[PDB]
Amino acid sequence: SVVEEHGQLSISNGELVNERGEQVQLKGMSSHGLQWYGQFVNYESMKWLRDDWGINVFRAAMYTSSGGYIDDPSVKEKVKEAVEAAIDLDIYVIIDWHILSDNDPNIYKEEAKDFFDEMSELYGDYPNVIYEIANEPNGSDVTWGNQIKPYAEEVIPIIRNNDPNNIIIVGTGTWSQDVHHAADNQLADPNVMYAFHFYAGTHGQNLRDQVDYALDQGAAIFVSEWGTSAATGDGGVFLDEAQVWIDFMDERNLSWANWSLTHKDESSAALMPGANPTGGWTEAELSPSGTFVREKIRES
């Protein structure tokens, strides 16, 4: 229903819109690393998220380092499973080249180009696909103008040779928080968005103001990862500040994906250790974070 109705997504005047030009807001879940918690990524769990939580997008977080794709490239087949499930379930899907410790996206740029060539050749004639080419550039030696923008200007042409206009999300500096610099020096492609990520354990008022600054430059922003926890993925849940962010994103109509769908013993994890990897969870099988996120997507 979702993808048949909204169809081809694009950016118009800095906003995500459907094929009629109407604003659309995606809300869903991210996997944890596919090399660690891939058992939670399958048609049945994704169908349960669609039908019981109301998700309309799923993010496949393919770590590059940390035992991910560079170390063992077999994980790309789990990305394919997730994309195919999203096609069968008629929801959108984010293919996330999940850099982190490999903090400069240029470290694995050759591999990224080959990976995104393959994915865009396979799936570029479906409207479901959204490409997230570098999760979180980070480090004071990795800047938008010197490192990230030029990386994007090599990977985007590879994708565009196979897929002229599905959405591309491009990470920003300082762990995808520095939307100000990106918004002042935007990419040319008209169907790009810039990633902004937050974790509710950080007091967020200035970060919200910086998102507004970026929006005011005509940059489109996708909140492709956020958590209810501290920035470590743990440290308790911060539901008061998470709700502030939820309301802010609704007012600005910003799409989002929550970190993350796993039973790992950390506060941002949505599931408790007895949750079935194929779905059907009871309330007791959701964590405090998962209960809250589920409520947010169902309310929507």
Ligand SMILES: OC[C@@H]1[C@@H](O[C@@H]2O[C@H](CO)[C@@H](O)[C@H](O)[C@H]2O)[C@H](O)[C@@H](O)c2nccn21
């Ligand atoms: O630390 C929380 C998350 C992080 O996941 C965290 O990665 C760590 C390192 O791999 C894992 O040990 C944690 O279990 C996971 O929650 C995301 O990979 C990253 O994009 C991000 N940036 C800011 C926070 N986070």
